Amino acid sequence: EPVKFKDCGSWVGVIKEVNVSPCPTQPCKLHRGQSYSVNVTFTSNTQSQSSKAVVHGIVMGIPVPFPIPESDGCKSGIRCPIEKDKTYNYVNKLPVKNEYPSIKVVVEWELTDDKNQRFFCWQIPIEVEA
Ligand SMILES: *[C@@H]1O[C@H](CO)[C@@H](O)[C@H](O)[C@H]1NC(C)=O
């Protein structure tokens, strides 16, 4: 479902929608061993041959890297090369892992371009359930 989020630095892209499922109301919650489906609609303001995603869980203000199944944006629903003013749908999953403490965690998701600049950066709170 479309979720409310905080933009943490979208620089060469413009976010149109952050859709995380299951998340009808917030904070999203999901148990360890299950994965969220993520679909980010954004419009690029630059051309780029490549794109790379990176996710962090900010736990009590401390960032921790959060692995995803595929980090190449061009293999995540985006047909590269990325073009200026074109709209894309970045799609991936976020597994909730046993290593994550079962408390509120802020998830930060980013996608960068050839120049390592942020197409998008957004944050949302999630509750990790054991
Ligand atoms: C991603 O969201 C768009 C709506 O912006 C929809 O057309 C598309 O099917 C969704 N993609 C998948 C793979 O979830």
Swiss-Prot record:
Q: Name one GO cellular component term.
A: endoplasmic reticulum
State the tissue distribution.
Answer: Expressed in kidney, spleen, liver and mammary gland, but not in testis.
Q: Which domain of life does the protein's organism represent?
A: Eukaryota
Q: Which residues, renumbered to this chain, carry the PTM N6-acetyllysine? A: K97
Query: Which positions are glycosylated?
Result: N39
According to its UniProt record, where is this protein located? Secreted; Endoplasmic reticulum; Lysosome
Q: Which InterPro entries match?
A: Ig_E-set, ML_dom, ML_Npc2-like, NPC2-like
Which transformation does this protein catalyse, written as a reaction? cholesterol(in) = cholesterol(out)
In this record, what's one Pfam family? E1_DerP2_DerF2
Q: Name one GO biological process term.
A: cholesterol transport
Q: Which cysteines are joined by disulfide bonds?
A: C8-C121, C23-C28, C74-C80
Q: Which UniProt keywords apply?
A: Acetylation, Cholesterol metabolism, Disulfide bond, Endoplasmic reticulum, Glycoprotein, Lipid metabolism, Lipid transport, Lysosome, Secreted, Signal, Steroid metabolism, Sterol metabolism, Transport
Gene Ontology terms for molecular function: cholesterol binding
The family this protein is said to belong to:
Belongs to the NPC2 family.
Entry comment, domain topic: Binds cholesterol in a hydrophobic pocket; there are no hydrogen bonds between the sterol and the protein.
What function is annotated for this protein? Answer: Intracellular cholesterol transporter which acts in concert with NPC1 and plays an important role in the egress of cholesterol from the lysosomal compartment. Unesterified cholesterol that has been released from LDLs in the lumen of the late endosomes/lysosomes is transferred by NPC2 to the cholesterol-binding pocket in the N-terminal domain of NPC1. May bind and mobilize cholesterol that is associated with membranes. NPC2 binds cholesterol with a 1:1 stoichiometry. Can bind a variety of sterols, including lathosterol, desmosterol and the plant sterols stigmasterol and beta-sitosterol.
Q: How does it assemble?
A: Interacts with NPC1 (via the second lumenal domain) in a cholestrol-dependent manner. Interacts with NUS1/NgBR, the interaction stabilizes NCP2 and regulates cholesterol trafficking. Interacts with DHDDS. Interacts with NEDD4L (via C2 domain). Interacts with NPC1L1.
- How is this protein named in the record? NPC intracellular cholesterol transporter 2
Q: Which organism is it from?
A: Bos taurus
